[PDB]
Amino acid sequence: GMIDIHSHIVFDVDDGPKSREESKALLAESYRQGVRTIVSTSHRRKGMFETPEEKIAENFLQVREIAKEVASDLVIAYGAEIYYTPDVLDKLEKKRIPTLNDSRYALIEFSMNTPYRDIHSALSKILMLGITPVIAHIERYDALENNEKRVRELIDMGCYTQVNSSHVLKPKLFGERYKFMKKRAQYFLEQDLVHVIASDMHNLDGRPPHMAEAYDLVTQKYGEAKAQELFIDNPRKIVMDQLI
Amino acid sequence: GMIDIHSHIVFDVDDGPKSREESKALLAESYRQGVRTIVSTSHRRKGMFETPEEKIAENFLQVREIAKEVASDLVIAYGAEIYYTPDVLDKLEKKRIPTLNDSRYALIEFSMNTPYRDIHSALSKILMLGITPVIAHIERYDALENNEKRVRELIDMGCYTQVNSSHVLKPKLFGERYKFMKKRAQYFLEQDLVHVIASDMHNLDGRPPHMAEAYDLVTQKYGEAKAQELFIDNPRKIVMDQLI
Ligand SMILES: [Mn+2]
Ligand SMILES: [Mn+2]
Ligand SMILES: [Mn+2]
Ligand SMILES: [Mn+2]
Ligand SMILES: [Mn+2]
Ligand SMILES: [Mn+2]
Ligand SMILES: [Sm+3]
Ligand SMILES: [Sm+3]
Ligand SMILES: [Sm+3]
Ligand SMILES: [Sm+3]
């Protein structure tokens, strides 16, 4: 029973599901693949994802009703994926934006080419609030490309890393769009710099969950024990508000 | 990975472990049997279990450190087993006594021969506080012996039932001390009146966890699906603060 801590399943709030039907379909697929817990982390990002918090709550609650139709033992928790801009700090401290399952952990996102010093500075200011940043899809940031020294630094301040399930997969030979993130992801896993693997699922045409598959690949390359850590135990600790 | 929502693992606080050594030994056994989550529910009972709440917290936190020695993926949550006396209501509402994992659920206990009207009255007054009572070892109460009508009533007010793992086991032919609770437990399982099975573990000489075994017996008699509900899914919902 996997716990997916990064998901876009709330409808009409961001670039995830546009309808209830689409939300129900996502949940169902996630369930097929063995996920029994999903943390909703819709986008909060000044400039492009500014849906009112009240509306996200409204729709999330509806999605939690829908989950019941998929399966009685599917647990939906609230949360958020937060794109760092300065305003975000007070919003977090005052609790106007959710942490993951109301725990100490917050899912934090940057741009592909955010300079390292900006990522670092931002993550410091969040730690100052007593909140623990889990860094969203570290494969994305150029700042961290092939750079363990920098990732260790962040982990050692008190951050934890998340990698997307789809970037654990192997590169295709025709029509690959994520060569660099797949290469980057594989490097972090080799260096043992990954705490969590999550789906970042948005839909069932382009951004599905690849959790079942990502799990079998990590099992083979890195061992069953590591797959369980990244896909179950560490997420378990996050959702239970305990330090990993 | 089972979740045990009823446990006496804090030392020098009640009739559970008397030492750290004994606490560590309990955790370890529970882990052997496949339990990955344990809710601490030490005794709060006017008249015989009156250890100051500050002291229970102090020692619980230490037990949570010890758990790390047993295994990194063992999660210890705080809670309490509450013996109903009137004072308990305000203590709960004001939060001077913990609910299970700080959820809406509280583990509630009575005496073997508490008349039904007293159990009922007490459980009403707790529901009035917005708290959901999970009834501790229902096998114990004479009021509920062979009496589905009464158990359904309670469940329908909004209570949930817990049965002890050791009372799921088969009766012995020499030196059985729990014939009646084993018979009673078996009856509730047949009538499908049990939401949760938990250990009520106190030690490793007389009151061990019988979770591994209780799980295999429920599997055989009632199906894998039911064992998972009682030993994993329903407890999962309790610890995640979601209505079962
Ligand atoms: Mn998106
Ligand atoms: Mn993102
Ligand atoms: Mn995302
Ligand atoms: Mn006891
Ligand atoms: Mn008891
Ligand atoms: Mn007990
Ligand atoms: Sm290295
Ligand atoms: Sm490691
Ligand atoms: Sm019946
Ligand atoms: Sm049932």
Residue numbers in the entry:
A (entry chain A), B (entry chain A): 0 to 243
What text comes from the article?
The function of these proteins is crucially dependent on phosphatases, which are homologs of either Cps4B in Gram-positive bacteria or WzbK-30 in Gram-negative bacteria. Since the dephosphorylation of bacterial tyrosine kinases, such as Wzc and CpsCD, is a crucial part in the capsular assembly process in both Gram-negative and Gram-positive bacteria, the phosphatases represent potential targets for drug development efforts. Furthermore, we show that both Wzb and Cps4B are capable of completely dephosphorylating full-length Wzc, establishing that Cps4B activity is not confined to its cognate CpsCD complex.
We solved the structure of Cps4B in two crystal forms, P212121 and P43212. The loop is involved in crystal contacts in both structures, but it would protrude into the surrounding solvent if the protein was in solution. Loop βF/α6 shows a significant conformational change between the two crystal forms P212121 and P43212. It is close to the active site and contains several hydrophobic amino acids that could potentially form hydrophobic interactions with the incoming substrate (e.g., Leu172, Phe173 and Tyr177). The loop is not well conserved over its full length, but many Cps4B homologs contain a FG(D/E)K/R motif in this position, where the phenylalanine corresponds to Phe173 of Cps4B.
